[PDB]
């Protein structure tokens, strides 16, 4: 199974409302070198923090797993 398994990905920073991100569905398996590119401020650092759990997720089905 993919280690980074995200279905909803409704990331947010404000504890009440204000979703910082939504509709994020990524399934990245282990040993998959995936470089991320994008525009300035287009949910890069926020996505990285949400991957480690540093960002509040409102509606997201995440099942973290390893080998
Ligand atoms: N912990 C946080 N709490 C609130 N807002 C945040 C937090 N972390 C990032 N943000 C903001 O949310 C947005 C997400 O942008 P993104 O994650 O792409 O930033 P970035 O990768 O640091 O951008 P840049 O290209 O400017 O370096 C930005 O406006 C950023 O300032």
Which residue's CA is the nearest one to ligand 1's atom 11? Answer: 46
* 21 C-beta neighbours (distance < 10 Å), count: 20
* 60 C-beta neighbours (distance < 10 Å), count: 19
Half-sphere exposure of residue 55, counting CA atoms within 13 Å on the CB side? 26
**What separation, in Å, do the N-terminal and C-terminal C-alpha atoms of the chain show?**
9
Q: Say how far apart CA 61 and CA 35 lie, in whole Å.
A: 23
Residue 6's nearest CA partner among 50, 66, 56 is 50
Output the CA–CA distances (angstroms, integers) from residue 1 to 10, 17, 21, 42, 66, in the order listed: 21, 31, 24, 28, 8
Beta bridge pairs of residue 57: 11
Which residue's CA is the nearest one to ligand 1's atom 22? Answer: 45
Resolution (A): 4.1
Output the CA–CA distances (angstroms, integers) from residue 7 to 22, 39, 40, 41, in the order listed: 10, 23, 24, 22
């Amino acid at each position: 199974n993919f280690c980074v398994q995200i279905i909803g990905g409704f990331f947010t920073w404000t504890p009440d409302g204000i979703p910082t991100l939504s509709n994020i569905t990524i399934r990245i398996p282990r040993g998959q070198l995936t470089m991320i590119v994008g525009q300035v401020g287009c949910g890069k650092s926020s996505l990285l923090l949400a991957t480690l759990g540093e960002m509040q997720k409102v509606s997201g089905a995440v099942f973290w797993n390893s080998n």
